[PDB]
Structures are given as C-alpha cells and as structure tokens.
C-alpha cells in the first residue's frame, strides 16, 4: 500500500526546550548556547513519507512508529532504526536495504538495545557521536496544545560515532530543525525548566536575555550592536601587464637543437597561467614537479620556459628521475619541479613520410650531463681504440640528426616538447598571476569591500590630490581614510561600514511588551 | 580582433603617412603587429611588423627608410609610418598580428600573420 | 621563396570537387605555410593554418592539400561562401603571400 497524506507550514511557538544538560539547578536563570529550535520558527506540519535531511537535528513531534536515523537510505550505511511497539521502546541498528517504504512487518551491523491522541515530542540530536534523544510524551488536550512550555528530559546517549543526514517516520510528524541559538532557561526551585527566551528573537527578548531577567523595567538599555555587509570588490593593482612567453613556446614553429635547451627567462609578467589548462590533450600534462594547478596562482621569478625537439623514446626521458637514453646523454631533468614540462608529438610538424633527419642530438655524447643544464656545449664521446681525440675511428658524432619517420613508434615520431623551470629564492619574483576588476569599482553601498590593499568599509569616491606617487592614505592615526584605483586614477576614499547600539526602549514588560529601538 | 584602422588616406607625392591601428581587445602588450601591403592586383606585399610589446621591426627593404613602423602603446594605435607617397604609392595595406615571427623576440614562432586591420585604403591621388 | 596560386580565375560551380594550386617552389613543409580568405576587397581571415587544415570558421565544402611545391588546394562541393578571395601563405622565409586563385562563377 501507499497512504499517504498532506502537508503544511506551522509556527513552532515557544517549545521544542530541552534539558541541555544532566545539571541540576535551581531557580537561577541560565543562559545556554546550545541548539534549540528557535522561537516562533516554522515547522512543517506533515500529514507521507519524505526524505527529510538531518540539519544538526528535529524537534520531532507527532500525535497517532519508528525512524530510521542513517545517511543513505539502503544496506550499506549502517542507518539507525528506532522502533516503539508496545513490547519495548527498543531499536535495530542495522542496514536492511530500503524497507520497501515502511514496516518490513538486516545486515552484519551492530549491537542492540531495549528500554493522533497526544504529542510524543521528540528532539533527536545527535553531535560527535552520542545520537542523542531527549523527549517528553505529553498527554496533551488534543489540538488545543500545539504550544504550552515543556521541557525535553534526555532519554539515552547511545555512543554512536556514526554520520547521519536522513530520517523519516513510519506508521503527526511535524520536523522542526535544530539551530545554535542561545537561550535563557528559568528553572524554578524544584529544578525544572519553567520559561525561556530566545535571545535573538526581538528586541524585547535580547533586552531579557543581557539583564539575565525575565521582567524588566523602564528604562532604555544597550543591549548589542549592529552591522556586517558582504559584496566582495577586488579591483586589483594591475591594468594590462605583459603576459609571459607562454603561448609563445606552446605555441612556436621552431624549437631549438635538443641540447641547446632553448630555456629563456620568461619575461616580466602577467604569466597568469590559465592559458595553460586550456589546451587540447597534451598527452604530457602530468606537472613534472608541483601539482599541475597552483602555477597561475604562485608568483615565482622565472619558470625559464626551455624550447627543444625530440622524439618520443627521448621524451620518455624527459622528466624528474626518469634517466635514460636523451637524459643519460643529452637533456637531464633535477630532482623535481621542472616546472611544469608539458610534451606533445609533433609528426604532423617535424617529420615528412621522407623519415625527416632534421633535428641534431646527441646520443654517445659521453655520459649522462648532471641535472638540468644548458648544453650547447656539444663535447665529443670518448670512443676509445685511440688516444688522439678520444673518438673512436674518427668523429664520434654527438650530432644525431632525429632521423625518425611518421610510421614508427611515436617513441621515434617528431617530439616538439615545452620544458619549464621556476625560480624562487632571490630578490622578490616577477611572474605571478591575480585576478583582476571585479567590478566598476561599487561607490556607494557599503560594498566595495577590498581595493589592492584589504579593507572591508564603505569604500566610494573621494576628492583628495594624491601627489601622484602616493597611492593611499591614512589619517592621524594609521587608518588608511583613502586609496586610488589601480586600474584607473579614481581617489576613493574610503569610510567604514557603519554601527552603534542598538538600545532598546521599555516601558516595562510590567507595563507592555512593546519597544521602542 | 578589430584592429581598427584609418580609410581613405589622403596623402600627397612628397609627404608622410600614419596610419591608424586601434590595437584591438586583445592584450597589445603581449603580441606583435605584422603589416602587408595589398597594392592593386599585386596579392599584398609585405610591409614589415612593430613588436607590441617592445617595437622590434622586420620592415621592408622596399620602404627601408621609407617604412617606419611605429604605433601609440598608450591609446593602443599603431602607426606603420611610410614617407615616400605618390600617386603610384596610392596603394592600401592592412595590420596583422605577427604570430609568424612570434613578438618579444623577433623570432619566427607557429601560427600566421594574426587578427587584421580594417583597412588603411591610401589615397594619394594626383 | 615563392608561392603560385595557378587557377587564378578557377570557374567551377557550387556542388563540385574542384582543385586550386597554390603550387609553392620549395618542399617547405604546411608546419609554416598556411592560407587565408579575405572578403573580395577585406582583409584576410585565417583560412587554412597548417595549409591543408580546417580551423573553426572553415565548412567542410572548403577542401585543398598539398605538399612540395604544387599545393593544389583541391576544393569540394563549392559555396559563395567559397567564393571569396584565398591567399595562400608561407609563413616559412620572409611571407610571401598569394594574390590570385579565386573560385569563381557562370
């Protein structure tokens, strides 16, 4: 079967208070911090089965079984499965895929444990472990008593260090969530939770709630302050800076003789790396050092960009460790950070089905060179069989023209490859990459909440000289009272958001409950 | 991207020209700026190229002196400069971001004669 | 060195595989020679870059290859909007441009 039923929307009056802790007390006023479900909020008022995520808890009540307390909805999760038939208020702890909506009337789990007529209230929490299930059946008046102060004496702990998000009933049902609120409790002498206020409800409960009091007298009294505002603008100091040569060896026709690694330093900046991910597959993306992100975002001198052509069973040994045959002669990569080394096949580009013999290299060259040099220095191999100049019967040839063939592996088709390295120890770097204009730089409405420098104000026009050097500027006392754009001329100075005390006036809660503010 | 250009240039048989070319909404900085001349009939002939970022230019032996390939880094116009006009120099020429000689370098670099100019059609009529 | 674009006044009409040399001099490889339409009277597009390839702005009816010295950019099925101007250019050795083969019309 399917009965279900209807919906509603409902104001949680003053309850859903529960014993925040196993404290006695008396007749003092408390002043909580705990999650309650704040006054006056909205429940909703089902009459049907829903899904219903765990927002840090329910004020659960209902008048005609059990709920099911787990994150996924199935055999895997270990979800909670509470139950109260008459035999005991007991529960199962196990998995059980999806009970077909309501009432199987199992899996390798958990332990156990056992313990529309009136308002089985119920605040489930649960915080860190400890499902925690305080509550309080009241016999109420039927419909009558949908509010009327009652506390939620806790029921069991149940040390539970497991991850909920859902729940729902089976076989009324008004889910109210739980919010970090605080209170004020007045337990009496007997020890008992008799009122409380919400603290942020209004203006008239806060002023109860900082006087510790329940009844307060005429008068006008500070209780807080007031302001925040977010719109974030983080016109940025730049304009147009140069860009990088990237694009320029990611993008060049001719790269250089394999040894003679065509590093440069890559020049100012805005080497704003996004240009990067961009690309289409690079089959050699895999950042040959840091992380393959990052890199627009991190500000290092140079990352001199190196520029060479090989062929793959070279490019196989292009890269950090990973010596062989080209870095055991010719091209040698450090420990790490190479960069962001990001190779590619050329065929299309350096090699004709003629097998192009272009590109010289250099295997028998004499030996591995050490980690990441530059090797125009081509020196002959010591070939042996002879003392005159090393080479063996005459010119040992460090001078391998690629001599590859679009029809071999792509171990020997045209590699035209981009190598890079950074630099970051020395007098401050040149490449790096912020953001730039958020936004047509937002005078007035206290939002233009940064410029270059942070700050966080009203930030607007303004009509200062600024000696044009000078960029911002403080007041008497180091409170910086005005900036400049840095994309345009623009002197804004600047003002803070805004605040003061709210007090708030009362002729009495003897007299009225109204106030002024 | 609309590399926007001067029109019917009015020059004259013993003066000197600057040509127009709003470097466009792209990053003038980081580019260079190739020129071709299309002289009537004769497909384009190659003009030279100012480097956007520092000015190094390739211009034409044709126009050695008379070319001089100038540009406003500021308002992002550029200026190919040609004194030596006349009625048989009344020929248009066009803009064209240099990506075959890569700028920054003055370096030969993959890709084309990039984004064009609108148009500098010279009228020196005599 | 030098590029020819020899069907200079190619007439075949739309809906037709035709074939437009450029016929370069040298072996130079399509790595640097490219080509680029312009408006009959415009400034040139990027037609084909890599001189045989099809970028984004270029149909599929534009066809044309060619390596060596003969480029003959062996056009497909035709459109007026095959019917600009194409210069076929060598970005290799100091660009000489194309000022000729057009497709043309009845």
């Known amino acids: 079967n399917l009965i279900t039923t209807t919906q509603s929307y409902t104001n949680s009056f003053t309850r859903g208070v529960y014993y925040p802790d196993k404290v006695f007390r008396s007749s003092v006023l408390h002043l909580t911090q705990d999650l309650f479900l704040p006054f006056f909020s909205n429940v909703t008022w089902f009459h049907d089965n829903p899904v219903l995520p765990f927002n840090d808890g329910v004020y659960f009540a209902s008048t005609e079984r059990g709920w099911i307390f787990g994150t996924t909805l199935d055999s895997k999760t270990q979800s909670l499965l509470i139950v109260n038939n008459a035999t005991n208020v007991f529960i199962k702890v196990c998995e059980f895929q999806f009970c077909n909506d309501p009432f199987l009337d199992a899996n390798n789990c958990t332990f156990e444990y056992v313990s529309f007529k009136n308002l089985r209230e119920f605040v489930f929490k649960n915080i860190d472990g400890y499902f925690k299930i305080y509550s309080k059946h009241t016999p109420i008046i039927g419909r009558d008593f949908p509010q009327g102060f009652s506390a939620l004496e806790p029921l069991v702990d149940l040390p539970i260090g497991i991850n909920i998000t859902r729940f729902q009933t089976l076989l009324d049902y008004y889910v109210g969530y739980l919010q970090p609120r605080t209170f004020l409790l007045k337990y009496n002498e007997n020890g008992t939770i008799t009122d409380a206020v919400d603290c942020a409800l209004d203006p008239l409960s806060e002023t109860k709630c900082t006087l510790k009091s329940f009844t307060v007298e005429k008068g006008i009294y500070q209780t807080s302050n007031f302001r925040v505002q977010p719109t974030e603008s983080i016109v940025r100091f730049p304009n147009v800076t140069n860009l990088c040569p990237f694009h320029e060896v990611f993008n060049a026709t001719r790269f250089a003789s394999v040894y003679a690694w065509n590093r440069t330093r890559i020049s100012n900046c805005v080497a704003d790396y996004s240009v990067l991910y961009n690309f289409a597959p690079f089959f050699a993306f895999k950042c040959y050092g840091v992380s393959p992100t990052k890199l627009n975002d991190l500000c290092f001198t140079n990352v001199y960009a190196d520029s060479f052509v090989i062929k793959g069973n070279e490019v196989s040994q292009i890269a950090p460790g990973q010596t062989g045959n080209i870095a055991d002669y010719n091209y040698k990569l450090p420990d790490d950070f190479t960069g962001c080394v990001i190779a590619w096949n050329s065929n299309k580009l350096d090699s004709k089905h003629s097998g192009n013999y272009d590109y010289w290299y250099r295997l028998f060259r004499k030996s591995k060179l050490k980690p990441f040099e530059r090797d125009i220095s081509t020196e002959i191999y010591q070939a042996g069989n002879k003392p005159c100049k090393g080479k063996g019967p005459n010119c040992y040839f460090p001078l391998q023209s690629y001599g590859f063939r679009p029809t071999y592996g792509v171990g020997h088709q045209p590699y035209r490859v981009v190598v890079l390295s950074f630099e970051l120890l020395h007098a401050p770097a040149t490449v790096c990459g912020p953001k730039k204009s958020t936004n047509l730089v937002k005078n007035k409405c206290v939002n233009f909440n940064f410029n270059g420098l942070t700050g966080t104000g009203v930030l607007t026009k303004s009509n200062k000289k600024f000696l044009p050097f000078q960029q911002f500027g403080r007041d008497i006392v180091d409170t910086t009272d005005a900036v400049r754009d840095p994309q345009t001329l623009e002197i804004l100075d600047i003002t803070p958001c805004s605040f003061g005390g709210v007090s708030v006036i009362t002729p009495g809660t003897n007299t009225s409950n109204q106030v002024a503010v | 991207v609309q590399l926007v250009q001067s029109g019917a240039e009015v020059k004259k048989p013993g003066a000197s020209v600057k040509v127009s070319c709003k470097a466009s909404?792209?990053?003038?900085?980081?580019?260079?700026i190739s020129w071709v001349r299309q002289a009537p009939g004769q497909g384009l002939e190659w003009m030279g190229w100012?480097?956007?970022?520092?000015?190094?230019?390739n211009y034409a032996q044709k126009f050695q002196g008379r070319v001089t390939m100038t540009t406003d880094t500021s308002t992002t116009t550029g200026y190919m400069e040609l004194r030596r006009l006349r009625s048989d120099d009344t020929a248009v020429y066009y803009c064209?971001?240099?990506?075959?000689?890569?700028?920054?370098?003055?370096?030969?670099?993959?890709?084309?004669?990039?984004?064009w100019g609108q148009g500098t059609l010279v009228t020196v009529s005599s | 060195i030098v590029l020819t674009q020899s069907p200079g006044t190619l007439s075949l009409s739309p809906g037709e595989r035709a074939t437009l040399s450029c016929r370069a001099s040298?072996?130079?490889?399509?790595?640097?020679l490219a080509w680029y339409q312009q408006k009959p009277g415009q400034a040139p597009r990027l037609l084909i870059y890599?001189?045989?390839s099809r970028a984004t702005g270029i149909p599929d009816r534009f066809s044309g290859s060619g390596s060596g010295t003969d480029f003959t950019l062996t056009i497909s099925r035709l459109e007026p909007e095959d019917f600009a101007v194409y210069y076929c250019?060598?970005?290799?050795?100091?660009?000489?441009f194309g000022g000729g083969t057009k497709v043309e019309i009845k």
């Open positions: 064209a971001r240099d990506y075959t000689r890569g700028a920054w370098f003055g370096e030969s670099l993959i890709g084309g004669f990039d984004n």
């Open positions: 909404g792209y990053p003038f900085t980081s580019y260079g």
């Open positions: 100012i480097s956007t970022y520092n000015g190094n230019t």
């Open positions: 040298q072996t130079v490889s399509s790595t640097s």
């Open positions: 890599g001189a045989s």
């Open positions: 250019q060598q970005h290799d050795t100091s660009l000489t």
